[PDB]
């Protein structure tokens, strides 16, 4: 009843965020789920002296 039947108002929950309290944070195990080679490089170096370089 009343003026306008139905047409109710609504309360919507939008975004939200987290104050990630520095006192606790567990990082778990890390992985990848796939592969794809981009680029690599292989080489070496030598010390032909009597001193560390």
């Amino acid at each position: 009843d009343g003026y306008r039947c139905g047409d109710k108002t609504a309360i919507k929950v939008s975004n939200f965020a987290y104050n990630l309290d520095p006192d606790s944070f567990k990082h778990g195990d890390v992985t990848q789920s796939d592969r794809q080679l981009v680029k690599t490089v292989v080489g070496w170096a030598v010390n032909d002296s009597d001193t560390p370089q």
């Binding site: 520095p22 006192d23 606790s24 944070f25």
Partner: protein, 53 residues
């Protein structure tokens, strides 16, 4: 022709006056400085939280 000026006014004449002209001016500068849209900023390292390994 500075030699012309010597024979016209006398060496010592100008010799002295030139010093009166060229001697150093010692002074204290008071006042301030201002400039338009320059850059400014800050950096901070906050206190450590005892939690890792």
């Amino acid at each position: 022709d500075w030699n012309w000026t010597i024979q016209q006014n006398g060496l010592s004449t100008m010799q002295n006056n030139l010093a009166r002209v060229l001697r150093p001016v010692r002074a204290g500068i008071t006042g301030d400085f201002s400039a338009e849209s320059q850059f400014a900023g800050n950096i901070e390292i906050g206190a450590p939280v005892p939690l890792a390994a």
